[PDB]
Ligand binder design. Structure first.
Ligand SMILES: Nc1nc2c(ncn2[C@@H]2O[C@H](COP(=O)(O)OP(=O)(O)O)[C@@H](O)[C@H]2O)c(=O)[nH]1
Ligand SMILES: C#Cc1cnc2sc(COc3ccc(F)c(C(N)=O)c3F)nc2c1
Ligand SMILES: [Ca+2]
Length: 306
């Protein structure tokens, strides 16, 4: 079994994330670009492109109307099904609050879920500066996504205002939000590809993520003194995420280290995660020894069930 991973961008923001991932380079993941806007879709370098709602929009976008996004996806349901064929896991990425993402992404997610794919949504909420209507439409989108996916990661764009200085380029800030998705997809790909000393596989991912509501995914890297605790704290930190570690009922945790990785420090890291999570948490713990590493330790967490 080698799980087939697909990343599906829906609407402008979703496709922006996909494009930036394709530019970065990601092996053994299929990218699918879905949009109403044919002009934007033409510029994508995704190898699978689905223009939805041509009869409805005439190749334009949804004009920020979620009803148009929804009806567009429904018009093109068979083409979406065809593109998803074979997927074992689907990441649906979209900016909530517009028309295409808000309306179409839940339709796409439901199609993926009903084909049996582990279906993870990774969506943004609008900046407060975009106004109340955008925020209200986005909230309806988030609720529709929750109903359609196995697990949902929400990135409030307002959180980007917490990680910039007054001069940080907007595109650099956007790359930080895109990195949430990138790290999660890369992380799952790495888990499926590599045999661990205490091995985690796709069935473990499914146990933690299938039908499990909100999710946090995180990665932390450290070295030197107190490296395990520092890496674990970085992994569970969620400056950009709506959902924090507190009260998690399911956790997939991995530690990657060199040959120096100690039992004591593995316990230290796991204890950091446990102290935060629910008393009856289903923790699935893994470890990898990468002898190419010297003093680096990597802690990764997927936390669900809130
Ligand atoms: N972080 C981030 N948010 C975006 C990006 N593009 C759009 N957004 C957000 O996504 C929302 C919907 O925009 P968009 O996806 O272009 O609309 P749609 O094509 O009608 O789905 C906007 O209101 C923004 O909050 C992006 O590249 N990065
Ligand atoms: C963000 C994030 C995030 C979340 N979860 C994960 S899990 C991951 C990779 O974990 C890995 C990689 C290689 C392995 F052999 C193993 C294993 N123990 O079998 C593993 F869990 N990377 C991330 C990254
Ligand atoms: Ca593995």
């Amino acid at each position: 079994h080698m799980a087939t991973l697909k990343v599906i961008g829906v609407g402008g923001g979703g496709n922006n994330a996909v494009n930036r991932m394709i530019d970065h380079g990601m092996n053994n993941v299929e990218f699918i670009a879905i949009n109403t806007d044919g002009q934007a879709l033409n510029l994508s370098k995704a190898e699978s492109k689905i223009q939805i709602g041509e009869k409805l929009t005439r190749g334009l976008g949804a004009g920020a109307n979620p009803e148009i996004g929804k009806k567009a996806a429904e018009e093109s349901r068979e083409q979406i099904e065809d593109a998803i064929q074979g997927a074992d896991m689907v990441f649906v990425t979209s900016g909530m609050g517009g028309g295409t993402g808000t309306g179409a992404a839940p339709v796409v997610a439901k199609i993926a879920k009903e084909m049996g794919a582990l279906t993870v949504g990774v969506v943004t909420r609008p900046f407060s500066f975009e106004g109340r209507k955008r925020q209200t439409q986005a909230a309806a989108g988030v609720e529709a996504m929750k109903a359609a996916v196995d697990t949902l990661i929400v990135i409030p764009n307002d959180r980007l205002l917490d990680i910039v200085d007054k001069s940080t380029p907007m595109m650099e800030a956007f790359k930080e939000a895109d990195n949430v998705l990138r790290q999660g997809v890369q992380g799952i790909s790495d888990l499926i590809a590599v045999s661990g000393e205490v091995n985690l596989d796709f069935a473990d991912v499914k146990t933690i993520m299938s039908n499990q509501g909100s999710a946090l995914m995180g990665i932390g890297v450290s070295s030197g003194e107190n490296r395990a605790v520092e890496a674990a704290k970085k992994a569970i930190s969620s400056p950009l995420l709506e959902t924090s570690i507190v009260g998690a009922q399911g956790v997939l945790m991995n530690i990657t280290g060199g040959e120096s990785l100690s039992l004591f420090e593995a316990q230290e890291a796991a204890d950091i995660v446990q102290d935060a999570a629910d008393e009856d948490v289903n923790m699935i713990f893994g470890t990898v020894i990468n002898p190419e590493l010297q003093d680096e330790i990597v802690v990764t967490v997927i936390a669900t069930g809130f």
